[PDB]
Structure formats: structure tokens, C-alpha cells
Write a protein that binds this DNA or RNA. Structure first.
Ligand SMILES: O=C1COc2ccc(N3C[C@H](CCNC[C@H]4Cc5cccc(Cl)c5C4)OC3=O)nc2N1
Ligand SMILES: [Cl-]
Ligand SMILES: [Cl-]
Ligand SMILES: [Cl-]
Ligand SMILES: [Mn+2]
Ligand SMILES: [Mn+2]
Ligand SMILES: [Mn+2]
Lengths: 670, 671
DNA sequence: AGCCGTAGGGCCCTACGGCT
DNA sequence: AGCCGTAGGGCCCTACGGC
């Protein structure tokens, strides 16, 4: 909805395009309303390079810009009717605002190309460090970005019409592989030429989606939003032994500290982590309505509560023992983990699916006993083959159970990273009395919506697209579990109906495996052994660093305790020394001198409470020291022999297998 | 919408009504889907005692119920066509769920009475402690509420049709005064008869809105949502000196801790406190788009940042010195203040508007300097008249400045608590060249939406209801301020046009004063002096309790200093005593009997660190003891003489006036 | 009239890749 | 063709009282 300017001389009038009304309100308050109109849009606009033509012309946003510009489109473009001589793209200073700019330019170039050639399209430059313009105060948006006296608008120029053509089709067109080859050749881990602006802005968007949004890290199997939710729960001590915490608090916590994005993305990613039909090993324990297999969303975040599951403690275990590198957060006010310790193989256990740019990923979940057995075998034989690994890891193990048809799709996916896996419901034919039968479905394929699949069966029966079905009911319940009943007409073959259902409904569904994950911060198609080799290497690194951290801290503490033991052994001299010093600093110097102490030891002596001089407190000091010396010698044994450290890796993985390993759910049928 | 059950036999089928899809999901997952259908609604349902039939019949929620029930309505009702023989009202277990229940009952009583008389209407009893059914797990909603083996449904009974009629008309009808009377007459601060159910659930709703939602407390000027926000900022140290904090963290924090309601009510309440066109003395310091006078909303909470203003530190000043009573929060997991110390008279300074039940409140804002001089005059003269307080407090002072026409409406509002005050835009007539003129408006009345005012004027011009306006523009800008231009046709009398605009548009707007506030937890219409009296009596209690807290605290400390003095004087024997003690208890027991020490004194000695034995601490400890003793008598002098306590209140008020007092913005012109 | 301000409640558009 | 899941972006109904 346009906020027009009062002047009607197009030569001096500017229209700014902003992402929405949050951004529009700061822009309206700061503008010069005589000459500066504002059109807030609605986020991502239609990609006209990919869209059917009738659909573009019906698009509400497309239509409001055409109307606003007054020019018309395509053949009917009349540049003499433009209502503004500066069209100013002013999206947010983040990667999504870069994307929206590339979509806006695609539309101008494909439908209002003379606007560009006439020098009418500009790119505003609002400062970085604000999530959107709505975060800026009006006078700041004026002085930095909109005031003609200070701003630095870039004018879009079209130099090479053929290169611009090709550019728009490669970046914005539907041939993914040309977009993908552009990203790989260019990935890096005033006036403005449109080709160049399109390239740099789309690459800026595409790389961010690839390494910091849609794909999981090979080491902990997490995407950034999930890693930040799980770190946020741990920062707040939201452990299984504590009471549930309001989901609104959690989301608001994670958004402000670590994840500068919309609340629905954070909340709905936390939700998936609590759903036992989505996560093979759920990472979040939800209290309340957390959605169903029928596609119902969760309850609004003001109602639900959450904490960590017990297995999530294994993801976070030893995160504060210098086991993983922390990084600066998005605004330099917080620290966050680049990766979680991940003391079970979470990428394969829970799987992943993510639509990135130029590529996607689709990793099925696995049984945790089999995975760790697989890692165990790899650790005892670096040259193990994929086939040997499949003796441990039979194939996927979906939270929703069901059946897998055959093994060659599994084997291809594990050997190459790509493969097609036919999944089936668990369905039986059974008698219902009076000579009649029914088909009874008790498990359905992974990621299939049950209500949607039932409606698809009702549509087929209604439209006479399948014969033999008299009735269709969902009898699922907490007491029953999943139970879908399809009653068969008397004397009709119910095996033929079922096989037809497998052909015409999601009762059979394929899972296309496409195992892409971040390896060393780069997207990579990996096979099964590589995924396990990267995980095992992470675990050797974590436990080595935890050992190195534990040894430093123990030695420091022992060093302190040696000072307290000296003080307990010479308590009268300690008192005399301190009492005869004017100041704490003279005391600290004199203690260092008399008793050969370090500064840290002297300050520990000065900080000791008189209660530490009682009998049982002196014994406590001696006991902690003796215990610490034994602990130090054990830690040093581990760092001195790579084999002992590798054996500690296997032992802690075996402990996790025994505590959290469960039975396989999906049956793999020959 | 409707998740129907599979049985088509009505006598065994039940339909549960819940507030929405969040509640519906838990209900749908817990139900027995053979006999239990579910219809989520959309929150507050239409009050059909107040609405006419055309609106009712086209309301989406009402239609869905009628279709689902199958019986038709009114004279078309047919009990034989009921698709269920149990209609179960299962709203959330909170006062707004009680309200929705009264609304649904009203609809059944007025359109489907034979359903009640057949005993087909029931009330479910989900357990308390959940914000909505969407917080329960599926299985616990089944076992507590839906399972026929353990549930306690209430069958709605109609026992006297004359009493029911009158009850529905009184509680839900148009006339407000009968509703207000029922609340006043009744407020206290497995089958169910419908009149009892309607009176109980409605009174619960009404009392909760009256005393814990829409009306300000007379002492600190705040409604519960605003108090909890501001307390929330203070408990997280979001002070003016610290950086801004993310609005979403604040809102999520306040909702979990103290305010179990929608995030839109929390965020919008914080937003208004940050608007210098809404608050005469803004309590929240906002970062980003916090809305405008055109009725633009604030940026969404994921974009904005907030902290306290400096004047808000005065609302919170002394909150940690036992000056106000803390209470348990909604779930018993937290403590929250019942009232803030409010070291400036914030009820009148910032005003309030609120719609409650059976009553509303409209308090206009005032100039801080005038208010405090008012309170000061009062404190010197309990018998002071309203005319004399108006020598200090001339009338409201809107953040939007503007003009007030005359004093008679102000005077009536201050004497009785009610009165109409005419607000006028600041408007001049000026030349624009070529012999033509214009009207220029630079200030609009309080709470008038500028863009809406402009389009009303434009509407009068295009509908030829006002002569002589040729053009109209909004030239407002950050550099210019508010500036609306109205061009006048050449030769037209721009003063006639102006006067017509005051008549026909919000350019002139009334403020209807209705000073209702909470006095001792009860709503009360109060005049200006009573409002000032209650505030001053608050300031006396706060300063007296603060003084008593510092006295208690200073005496505990001097006591500790006396025990440490003794230790430092016998430090060798203190150390030995301790060293030969196996446990801290034996040490405690020994120190007390040897040096005549209390438990806390001997605990302080055992807690003392070694660095405290340096040779100037004894004098440093003696130094603090003798100032503390000077400090204890200063405090005791205040508590011994009420005139001194009163003078201390005046002194701290005068200093607040000097630091935050500012000039009057609204001009009162005579009438 | 419809607006003030705390409350109850929810829906739909867009991009992106790969499988059907 | 339209589904999967992280992302960008917003709008409407209801109660309540006084004018
Ligand atoms: O308690 C907390 C904690 O952390 C938070 C972070 C962030 C946000 N939020 C919420 C809000 C966006 C969600 N509602 C948008 C409405 C627009 C619209 C239009 C038509 C139909 C519908 Cl249904 C809707 C829904 O914007 C924002 O930033 N809230 C919270 N709350
Ligand atoms: Cl300590
Ligand atoms: Cl304090
Ligand atoms: Cl208005
Ligand atoms: Mn944005
Ligand atoms: Mn509710
Ligand atoms: Mn008027």
C-alpha cells in the first residue's frame, strides 16, 4: 500500500521499496514526504525468471509496483509515464535483503528493462548491524540512507545486454546445475553494473544459505538454528532434571542472543526436535500440543513448554571443557559454539533434510545401536569397506517404523551418497466378520501426513479411481497407536486393492537419499564411511581436548592447594605476616617472599575463610589434593598414548550405546 | 475446522467446544474419535444479547456451531435433528475461558434453549495450572477431562426461565448500569444450574478485569501488564546506562515470569510506554520503529529494542528496601511487586485509559512540575480546597500539547472526577502568496490519529460538506514537526473555514474525564484531591518503611561490626579456638561462649577471610561502626517525628521536581 | 460510528532443490 | 505437481464502556 509523496513532478520524486511495514514505518517517519514515496512489500517477491506468465501478472506485489510506477510492462512500457525518476531498492542489510534485491532486479530487467537503461533504478545502502530498517530510528535512516545531502545511492547500469541476459538466466533460472557451478567456482569461505551486483548479491545469499542455514555439519549433524536452540537450552540450564520452561522465553532468548531471524523459524525448528514421529531420537522434551502426524501444527509458543531430553545432554556433554571452538555471535555481544561435542553420531541417527541454494540434502535417520557398532568397527579397522559397515548398519531406521523394500537402494546410497529407498506402510489384511475383510494400516512411511493420505484414498474411491473399497476410517488413538482401517467389499480381492493402494497413494513412498553436509565448512556429498570417519575424528578431537583441559585445570587447582597446605602447615607465620602488613598488597608480596609462593597462591591464602582452619576443613583440603594428584596421573596416561585415548573414545561410545540404544523399528525386507 | 467422530449415532456422540487450534490439537490427540467430535472456535465469541440477528447469522463461529449441531435455531429448532446429545463447553481454565463460557451459554440460551432443557449442554472441568489446553499433553487431557470413567462433566440445568431471562439480560445485555450494580452488590475482594453458573463465571471475569487488567492503581498509576514489564526490566538491570535489550527477550521473559497472556498485549503495552505522543513522561526508552501518530504500529518485536527511561528509575527507586509488599506470581514460582514505590505521582502525570466491565476509566495526563507543587501544597494543608490546588495544577497537560477551551470542564473534572474538556489543535491562518491563505496545524489533540483526521477533512471536501478548502497536505517531518496545511480558496474567510473544521472534524475533540482507579484493591471514582491524598499517603508509607528497613539493616551491621571488633582484639585466641575445633558447629559454639557472641556474629568471624587481618582494618572497622551509629540515630530521629518524616518526603519530591520537572505544553485558553 | 487499550483466538504469500 | 523445512513479510475477528 503506497505512501505517496505530495509532489507530482516525476523528475524530482523518489519511491523507496522496503521489505515490509516494520521497515516501512521507520522509512515513513524519516522521509521527506514532499518528494519521497514509500512502497512496503511483503518479503520475498515472486521470481519472475521461474514463474508462469499469468501468475506474475496476478501477483499482488508485482501489481502494486506496476501501478505505483505508472509505466506498464513488456510491450506497453511507456517511460514517459513513470511517476518517479528514482526507483530505490532499500531492503534490509542482511543476506535475505540481498536475495530480495536480486528478485526485484530480475523483475525490473525482465519486465521494465527501459527503467534500468534510462538510469532510473538505484540501490540504497543502509548500514550494517541492524536486522531490518524497523530496528533503526527514523532520523538514523534519514541521515545514513535517505537524505539526498549525505546518502550514497548506487545507480544501476546495464553495460552488456547479452551478459546480463545470461547472468539472469544462470542465477535465477530453473537450471540448478548452472547455479550450482557458479557457486562452486566463486565460493569464498558510486555507479553499479547490474551483472556484477546480481552476481555478488546472489552469491552472498547462496553461500549464507549453504554454510549457515540449510545444511547440517557433518560433526554434530546440526543446522545453525538447531545448534543455537540446543545451546540456548544449555545456557539457561534447561536440563531434564529441571522443570519445563515456557517456549516463548526460550525462543526470545535464542533470537536475541544467537539467531537473528523470525520467531516461527526458531519455534517450529524446536517443535520438530520434540516430535517422536519426526526425530528418531528427539532432542527436545515438549510439554503440551507439539503437533501430530496429521499435519496439525504445534500450539502457539505462549502455551507450550520445553526442556532438553536426556540424550541431548550427550550432545552438549563437555562443551565447557574447551572441546569445541566458540565464535563471536552475530553482533559481537555473545559467544556461541561453532559445533557441539556430539557424543553420539547425531547426523546419521537423526538424519536431515534441507533445501539450500544450488543443492539440497536428504539424510535418513538410523538406529543408534547400529551406528555406534559401526563406529566401533571403523575405529578398529581404518580400511573397513562399506559392505563390512553394512553388517553393523542394516539401513535407515525411521521413527515411524514401517518397511523398506529391498537393499540395493540402501547400498547405493551408502556407497555413493545417493540412492532411492522404497518405503511401505505396515499393512495387514484381516477378517471383519460375515465373509468380509479389511486392510489395516498401523505404520506409515516417514514424513507422510496421515490425514492427507487418507483423504487421497477417499478421493480415489469417490472419483472411482480404485475399486473394491467400501469404507475408510482412522481409528488412531493414544491407546491404539496408528490404526487406519480400509474395509473391502465382500468377495473382492483385498490383496489387489492393497497393491493398487501402494501404486496410487503414499502408502508406498520413496526416500531419495542425497547425503550432503558441511565438511570443513564446505558442502560435500559424502558416503556412509566418510560420514562415520568425520564423526569418529570429531570424537577423538573432543576427548583429547577435554583431557587437555581437565589436566590444565587440575594442575592449577593442585597448585592452589599446595599453597593452602603450606599455609595450614605454617599458620602462625601466615597470621603474623598478614597482620603486620599495612595493606593486602604488602601482605601478598610478603607471603610470596616468605613462603616461596606464586601470586595466585598468595591470593588464595588471603582469600581463605577462617572456617577453613577447623579440623574437618583441613582434612578436606588434604583429601582434595591427594585425589587430584591421582586424577592428574590418570589424565597424563591418556595423552601419552594415542591408543589409550582411542580406547577411551570406544568406551564412552559403548556407554552411550548401552544407555540409549534401542531396537530397530523399520523392517528391511528382501 | 470440525473434526467429526465416526459414529453417526447421536445419543452416544459428544462434541467438545474449545477455544482454538492450540487447544484443539491436544483435544484431537487425546479424544476417543469414535464418539467425540471437536470444534475449535476463535477465542472471544459474539455476545448475541448485544448483537442484532443479521450480525449473528453471518458470524463465522456461530455458523459453524449451527451447522455442526444440526438442529437449526429459534423457531426452526428441532431437537430430533441433534447430531450429538452432549455439547461440552471446554474452554481454557482461566477467567477469559470463563468469559467465553458465558458467551457460549448466552448463545445456547437465546437460540437453542430446548437443547439446554433436554440436558444436552455440559461444562467440562479441565484442571487449573495450565495457561490453555494446548499446554496439556494429550493423555492428561484425556484422563482428567474427557475420559468417561474419570471425568466430572457438569450438566447445565435450567430451573426457572424467568430468573434465567433476567440474568442473561442483566449480565450480558446493553444496559451497563445493571451490570455495574450486580458487580458492586456481589464483588468480594455434577450438575450446574445455569443462573448460578452465569453469575459465578461472569463475576469472576468481571472482577478479574476490574482489579487485575484494565484499571490503574491509584498509588503508582499502573495496570498489571505495565507494572510487570517495568518490574521485568528492573529485575534484569535494563537501566538507562546499559545498552538496549531485544524487545522479544523482554516480552518472552515477562510472559513466562509474571504475565501469562498473549505476547501482543505485552509488546503493545511496552510500545505505548515508549511513545512520546502517548506518554507525557515516557517510561520505556525504545530503539526502532515504535509507531507514529498516524496509527502506524510499531515494528514487530523481533526488530525493536528497549530499556528503562531515567524517570522510570524513580518509579522503581527503593523497591529493594521493603517499601512495597511483594506477592506470589501466577504459578507460585516467582515473586512480583503488588505496587511500585512510585516516587513521582505517575497516575496523574501519565494518565490512563481503560475499558473494564461495568465501568471504564479515562484519566488525562498532567504536568509533573504542577503535580508535585500540588502534592507539596496538600502536604502543608490537609484542608486544602480544589480551587486552591488548581493554583498549582491548572489542568491536564497532553504530550501532544494543543489547546484546552476554558476552565469549567477542568473544574468539574477535578471536583467530581468527571467532566468534559474540549481539546483544540493549535492552528493559525497565514498567507501563501498570490493573495491566497492557508490554515497551518502544528499540534493535534491528544489521542487523535493525524492521518485519520486528514482523511476525514478530505472526505468533507470531496462530499461537499465544507466550503472553501482547495487543497490539503501533511507536511509533517522530523525536522518540521507536525505540520498539516489546508489551502483556502482565494477570497474565502479562512477563519470561518477553521471554525467549521473544529465542528466537523477531530481538529477539535472532547476528552471525557472519568477518574476511576483502584483504591485499596477496589475501583473508585475519585476527584483530584483524593487522587493526590492517596498518592501522598503512599509516599509516607514508602519513606517510613524504607527508613525502618535501613534501621533494621544498620543495626544488624553494627552488631556484626561489634563481633568482628572482638575477634580482631583477641585474634590469636580466636584462631586457636577455631583450629582445635573439629567442626564449624563446635567452633561456633566455642566462640559464642568465650567472647559472648551471637550466632550471626560468630558466623561472620568464621566467614572472615585472612586478608581482613591487615593492620588498618581494625580502624577501618571502627571507622564504619561510628558512622553507622551516627546513621542509626539519624534514621531513628525520622521515625520518632512524623513532621521530620513528612519534611523528608517533601525534600525528595522537590528534588524529583527539579530533575524531571518540565514546562507546560498544552495552553489553556479562557472559558 | 468507530475509536480508545488490554484481553481471547488464528492464515497465507514468497524462495529454494529434488523427488513424485 | 506439490511436498519436505528454514527463511523473508504481514491482518483479522471477538468483549468491554463512553461518547
Ligand atoms: O513471546 C515471544 C518471544 O519471542 C518472540 C519473537 C518474535 C515475535 N514476533 C511475533 C510477530 C510475528 C508473528 N505474528 C505475525 C502475525 C501477522 C499475521 C497476519 C495475518 C495472520 C496472522 Cl495469523 C498473523 C500473525 O513478530 C515478531 O517479531 N514474538 C515473540 N514472542
Ligand atoms: Cl569461598
Ligand atoms: Cl532499591
Ligand atoms: Cl480519532
Ligand atoms: Mn528483512
Ligand atoms: Mn485461552
Ligand atoms: Mn470536532
Amino acid at each position: 500500500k503506497l505512501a505517496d509523496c505530495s509532489s507530482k513532478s516525476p523528475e524530482e520524486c523518489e519511491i523507496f521499496l522496503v521489505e515490509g511495514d516494520s521497515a516501512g514505518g521507520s522509512t515513513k517517519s524519516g522521509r521527506d514526504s514532499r518528494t519521497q514515496a514509500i512502497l512496503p512489500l511483503r518479503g520475498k517477491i515472486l521470481n519472475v525468471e521461474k514463474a508462469r506468465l499469468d501468475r506474475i501478472l496476478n501477483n499482488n506485489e508485482i501489481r502494486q509496483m506496476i501501478t505505483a510506477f505508472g509505466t506498464g510492462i513488456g510491450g506497453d512500457f511507456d517511460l514517459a509515464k513513470a511517476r518517479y525518476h528514482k526507483i530505490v531498492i532499500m531492503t534490509d542489510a542482511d543476506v535475505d535483503g540481498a536475495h530480495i534485491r536480486t528478485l526485484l532486479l530480475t523483475f525490473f530487467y525482465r519486465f521494465m528493462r527501459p527503467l534500468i537503461e534510462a538510469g532510473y533504478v538505484y540501490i540504497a545502502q543502509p548500514p550494517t548491524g541492524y536486522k531490518g530498517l524497523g530496528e533503526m530510528n527514523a532520523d538514523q535512516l534519514w541521515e545514513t540512507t535517505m537524505n539526498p545531502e549525505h546518502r550514497a545511492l548506487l545507480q544501476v547500469k546495464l553495460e552488456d545486454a547479452i551478459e546480463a541476459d545470461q547472468t539472469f538466466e544462470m542465477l535465477m533460472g530453473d537450471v540448478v546445475e548452472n547455479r550450482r557451478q557458479f557457486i562452486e567456482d566463486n565460493a569464498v569461505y558510486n555507479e553499479r553494473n547490474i551483472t556484477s551486483e546480481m552476481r555478488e548479491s546472489f552469491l552472498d545469499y547462496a553461500m549464507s544459505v549453504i554454510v549457515a542455514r540449510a545444511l547440517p555439519d557433518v560433526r554434530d549433524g546440526l543446522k545453525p538454528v538447531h545448534r543455537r536452540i540446543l545451546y540456548g537450552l544449555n545456557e539457561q540450564g534447561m536440563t531434564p532434571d529441571k522443570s519445563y520452561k515456557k517456549s516463548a522465553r526460550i525462543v526470545g532468548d535464542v533470537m536475541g542472543k544467537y539467531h537473528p531471524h523470525g520467531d516461527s523459524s526458531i519455534y517450529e525448528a524446536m517443535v520438530r526436535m520434540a516430535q517422536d514421529f519426526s526425530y528418531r531420537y528427539p532432542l527436545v522434551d515438549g510439554q503440551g500440543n507439539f503437533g501430530s502426524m496429521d499435519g496439525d501444527g504445534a500450539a502457539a509458543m505462549r502455551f507450550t513448554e520445553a526442556r532438553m531430553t536426556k540424550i541431548t545432554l550427550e550432545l552438549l556433554r563437555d562443551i565447557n571443557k574447551d572441546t569445541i571452538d566458540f565464535i563471536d555471535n552475530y553482533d559481537g555481544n555473545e559467544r556461541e559454539p561453532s559445533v557441539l561435542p556430539a557424543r553420539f553420531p547425531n547426523l546419521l541417527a537423526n538424519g536431515a533434510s534441507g533445501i539450500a541454494v544450488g543443492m539440497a540434502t536428504n539424510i535418513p535417520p538410523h538406529n543408534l545401536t547400529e551406528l555406534i557398532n559401526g563406529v566401533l568397527s571403523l575405529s578398529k579397522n581404518p580400511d573397513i569397506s562399506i559392505a563390512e559397515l553394512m553388517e553393523d548398519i542394516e539401513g535407515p531406521d525411521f521413527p515411524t517404523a514401517g518397511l523398506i523394500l529391498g537393499k540395493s537402494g540402501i547400498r547405493r546410497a551408502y556407497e555413493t551418497g545417493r540412492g532411492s529407498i522404497q518405503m511401505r506402510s505396515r499393512a495387514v489384511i484381516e477378517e471383519r466378520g460375515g465373509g468380509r475383510q479389511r486392510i489395516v494400516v498401523t505404520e506409515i512411511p516417514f514424513q507422510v501426513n496421515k490425514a492427507r493420505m487418507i483423504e487421497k484414498i477417499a478421493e480415489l474411491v469417490r472419483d472411482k479411481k480404485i475399486d473394491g473399497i467400501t469404507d475408510l476410517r482412522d481409528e488412531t488413538s493414544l491407546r491404539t497407536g496408528v490404526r487406519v482401517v480400509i474395509d473391502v467389499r465382500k468377495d473382492a480381492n483385498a490383496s489387489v486393492i492393497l497393491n493398487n493402494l501402494y501404486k496410487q497413494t503414499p502408502l508406498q513412498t520413496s526416500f531419495g537419499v542425497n547425503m550432503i553436509a558441511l565438511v570443513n565448512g564446505r558442502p560435500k556429498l559424502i558416503n556412509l564411511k566418510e560420514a562415520l570417519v568425520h564423526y569418529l575424528e570429531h570424537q577423538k578431537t573432543v576427548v583429547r581436548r577435554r583431557t587437555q583441559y581437565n589436566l590444565r585445570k587440575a594442575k592449577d587447582r593442585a597448585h592452589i592447594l599446595e599453597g593452602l597446605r603450606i599455609a595450614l602447615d605454617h599458620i602462625d607465620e601466615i597470621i603474623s605476616t598478614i597482620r603486620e602488613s599495612d595493606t593486602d598488597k604488602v601482605a601478598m608480596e610478603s607471603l610470596q617472599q616468605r613462603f616461596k609462593l606464586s601470586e595466585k597462591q598468595a591470593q588464595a591464602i588471603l582469600d581463605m575463610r577462617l572456617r577453613r582452619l577447623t579440623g574437618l576443613e583441613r582434612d578436606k583440603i588434604e583429601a582434595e589434593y591427594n585425589e587430584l594428584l591421582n586424577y592428574i596421573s590418570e589424565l597424563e596416561t591418556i595423552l601419552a598414548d594415542e591408543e589409550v585415548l582411542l580406547q577411551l573414545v570406544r568406551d564412552e561410545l559403548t556407554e552411550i550405546r548401552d544407555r540409549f540404544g534401542d531396537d530397530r523399528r523399520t523392517e528391511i525386507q528382501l
